[PDB]
């Protein structure tokens, strides 16, 4: 069957009109109308520099797309892999069940990597790129991507793939004829936190996530790989941790699997950042070691935030031999990360107090048993754990901790320093802690629970009702949450943001809907920091959702497809 409608741009809105045969004007398909009716067309995220999309499209032979790398170097296999994936991303323009006519011009993609040896992740890496498309001769297209590193190069490959549209009226694959794009991100840390300990996530689902992250230029997969409920990380030096801590023998993450994920991410510009939360958020796996306290302590509401309770015992010297082995095994397989997340989630003082060995350790020292003295013990633990982390990675590298009582800006300088520790922020953007931390020079990663906790809104998992941070955070609230508004003058200290998917109520089955397309809103906010609000990005957000679905992502549905086909009629 054949498409019946056509679309025509009118005041920045594609209006659906009947495709009457008695017309001399060529019918426009829906996406062809959108590509030029919209200020930024079908691009997500919108570029930050020049965004010249011209006015016309060119028909393209899908089979005549060839990529040529002009500068060889150490990133040859990376550029070759990113070039091979480029054609699959072009086929994403075509709806499933439709076949384009193998007709039209040929495309020449010219990749220019100005530093073809650089392939390390760093907060200072250059993700910029230049993209220009123009006719070449009489039957060819010259698409030239120029970037200072491979990572910017494959960002430009991503943007180039979004410049293809499928004409489902005529079954023609089209491309923007004359493009001039210069682009670079506003923030260097654009991440997603995946909790794979409160519930297991298949390795295939994790790599599907990375695929969708690269599609919107997110670059950091924060792998919250352990917690109280399970220990799926296969640590070779301490094998009892995962053998006793895993939910099942197959719900683990082997060295080979992690190397797969890490390499999969590197090929797509995604740094895989591992976290070992400590000294709280520990439990299963540590049985028979006597290195924890209050594991499964009852009543749990007296001893921890959520069951099961359990914290490391920092007074045992053997603890830091365990941690050193854990970090070392992590550093072996997570060999592309430049940052290590050490958790620092809120420690329960009632739990540490209920241990005699801990109380004796503090009486033996010059400490009492008050709130201030358990801050002594926490900093005592963090100081030694930090030493082992440095040794394990064979290098002093940035460490991340959460906002907590340990990182309260009023006394954080007693324990940490702004050069060694990055602070991940879960508090709201109007919380005084953010201003105080910024004035002390600390660098921040924004994960405000009122706009970036992707677990909020569902039913309660203890008792009845809804979970603690309900209501559900729509993509509009994710888009409008701006770190520049939150940090103001200190915005350069903000390294970026990170959508947090805690997995008390999420696993392999719910992964796609939890993250997409809401994380794409965070992707544009962190890449472009637009002065405009979500309503200006609404039409493009609807398209990027459809693109996710085409990739095989079970993305959440935002609006009726009728609204997508009838821009302007769905408003409030
Ligand atoms: C493809 O297009 C690119 C950019 O439009 C061309 O590269 C430019 O070449 C001119 C001279 O011919 C230089 O002054 C510019 O600095 C180049 N731009 C960049 C970004 O490198 C390229 O020559 C074209 N290739 C073909 C085969 O037509
Ligand atoms: C780190 O930020 C976090 C992280 C996790 C948090 C978890 C919970 N709370 C704040 C949190 C928080 O804000 C402090 C509020 C109380 C609460 C009750 C619960 C629950 C979870 C939580 O599940 C069972 O009943
Ligand atoms: C620790 O336990 C003792 C009881 O021996 C109590 O007096 C003290 O207040 C407790 N500390 C905290 C922080 O609750």
From Swiss-Prot:
UniProt-recorded name of the protein: Chitooligosaccharidolytic beta-N-acetylglucosaminidase
Give the species.
Ostrinia furnacalis (Asian corn borer)
Disulfide bond entries: 9-37, 14-33, 294-351, 304-309, 456-469, 563-570
In the record, the note on similarity to other proteins reads: Belongs to the glycosyl hydrolase 20 family.
Q: Where is this site: Important determinant of glycosidic bond specificity?
A: 305
Give the protein's function: Hydrolyzes one beta-GlcNAc unit at a time from the non-reducing ends of substrates, with a preference for shorter substrates. The 2-acetamido group and the beta-glycoside bond linkage in the substrate are required for its activity. Active with p-nitrophenyl (pNP)-beta-GlcNAc, pNP-beta-GalNAc and chitooligosaccharides (degree of polymerization from 2 to 6), but not with the complex N-glycan substrate (GlcNAcbeta-1,2Manalpha-1,6)(GlcNAcbeta-1,2Manalpha-1,3)Manbeta-1,4GlcNAcbeta-1,4GlcNAc-PA (GnGn-PA), pNP-alpha-GlcNAc or with the long polymer colloidal chitin. Involved in chitin catabolism.
Q: Give the result of residue 305 to G, as annotated.
A: 5.3-fold decrease in Ki for PUGNAc inhibitor as a result of widened active pocket entrance. Slight decrease in KM, but decreased catalytic activity with 4MU-beta-GlcNAc or GlcNAc-beta-1,4-GlcNAc as substrates
Indicate how biotechnology or industry puts this protein to use. A potential target for eco-friendly pesticide development because of its species specificity and narrow substrate spectrum. Q2, the designed non-carbohydrate naphthalimide-based inhibitor against this enzyme has potential use as pharmaceutical or pesticide as it selectively recognizes chitinolytic beta-GlcNAcases, but not glycoconjugate-lytic beta-GlcNAcases.
Q: How is the enzymatic or functional activity of this protein modulated? A: Inhibited by O-(2-acetamido-2-deoxy-D-glucopyransylidene)-amino-N-phenylcarbamate (PUGNAc). Inhibited by thiabendazole (TMG)-chitotriomycin. Inhibited by 6-(dimethylamino)-2-(2-(((5-methyl-1,3,4-thiadiazol-2-yl)methyl)amino)ethyl)- 1H-benzo[de]isoquinoline-1,3(2H)-dione (Q2), a synthesized non-carbohydrate unsymmetrical dyad of naphthalimide and thiadiazole having a dimethylamino group at C4 of the naphthalimide.
């Amino acid at each position: 069957e054949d498409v019946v409608w056509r679309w025509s741009c009118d005041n920045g809105k594609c209006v659906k009109l009947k495709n009457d045969p008695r017309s001399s004007e060529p019918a426009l398909s829906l996406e062809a109308c959108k590509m030029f009716c919209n200020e930024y067309g079908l691009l997500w995220p919108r570029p930050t520099g020049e965004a010249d999309l011209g006015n016309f499209l060119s028909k393209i032979n899908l089979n005549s797309i060839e990529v040529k790398i002009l500068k060889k170097g150490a990133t040859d296999d990376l550029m070759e892999a990113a070039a091979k994936r480029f054609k699959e991303q072009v086929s994403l323009a075509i709806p499933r069940g439709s076949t384009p006519k193998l007709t039209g011009k040929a495309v020449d993609v010219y990749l220019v990597n100005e530093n073809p040896n650089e392939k390390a992740f760093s907060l200072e890496m250059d993700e910029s790129y230049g993209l220009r498309v123009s006719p070449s001769g009489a039957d060819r297209v010259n698409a030239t991507i120029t970037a200072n590193s491979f990572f910017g190069m494959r960002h430009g490959l991503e943007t180039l793939s979004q410049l293809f549209v499928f004409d489902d009226i005529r079954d023609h694959l089209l491309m923007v004829r004359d493009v001039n794009i210069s682009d670079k991100p506003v923030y260097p840390y654009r991440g997603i936190l995946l909790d794979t300990a409160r519930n297991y996530y298949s390795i295939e689902s994790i790599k599907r996530t990375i695929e969708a992250m690269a599609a919107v230029k997110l670059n950091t997969d924060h792998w919250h790989i352990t917690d109280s409920q399970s220990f799926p990380f296969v640590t070779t030096k301490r094998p009892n941790l995962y053998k006793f801590g895993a939910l099942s023998p197959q719900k683990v993450y082997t060295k080979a699997a992690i190397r797969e994920v890490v390499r999969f991410g590197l090929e797509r510009g995604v740094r895989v950042l591992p976290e070992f939360d400590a000294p709280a958020h520990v439990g299963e796996g540590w049985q028979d070691t006597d290195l924890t306290v209050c594991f499964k302590a009852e009543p749990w509401k007296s001893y921890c935030v959520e069951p099961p309770c359990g914290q490391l015992n920092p007074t045992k010297d053997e603890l830091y031999q365990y941690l050193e082995d854990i970090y070392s095994d992590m550093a072996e397989v997570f060999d592309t990360t430049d940052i290590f997340h050490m958790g620092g989630d809120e420690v329960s003082e009632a739990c540490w107090n209920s241990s005699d060995s801990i109380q004796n350790f503090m009486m033996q020292n010059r400490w009492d048993l008050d709130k201030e003295s358990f801050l002594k013990l926490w900093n005592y633990f963090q100081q030694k754990a930090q030493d082992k982390a440095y040794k394990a990675f064979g290098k002093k590298l940035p460490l991340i901790l959460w906002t907590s009582t340990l990182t309260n800006y009023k006394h954080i300088d007693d324990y940490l320093n702004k050069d060694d520790y990055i602070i991940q922020v879960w508090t709201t953007g109007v919380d005084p802690q953010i201003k105080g931390l910024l004035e002390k020079g600390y660098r921040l990663i924004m994960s405000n629970y009122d706009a970036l906790y992707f677990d909020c809104g569902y039913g309660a998992w203890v008792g009845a009702g809804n979970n603690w941070c309900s209501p559900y955070i729509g993509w509009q609230k994710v888009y409008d949450n701006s770190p520049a508004v939150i940090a103001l003058e200190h915005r350069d200290q903000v390294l970026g943001g990170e959508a947090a998917l805690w997995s008390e109520q999420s696993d392999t089955s719910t992964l796609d809907g939890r993250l997409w397309p809401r994380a794409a809103a965070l992707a544009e906010r962190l890449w472009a920091e637009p002065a405009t609000s979500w309503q200006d990005a609404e039409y493009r957000m609807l398209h990027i959702r459809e693109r996710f679905v085409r990739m095989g992502i079970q993305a959440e549905s935002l609006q009726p497809e009728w609204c997508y086909q009838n821009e302007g009629y769905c408003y409030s």
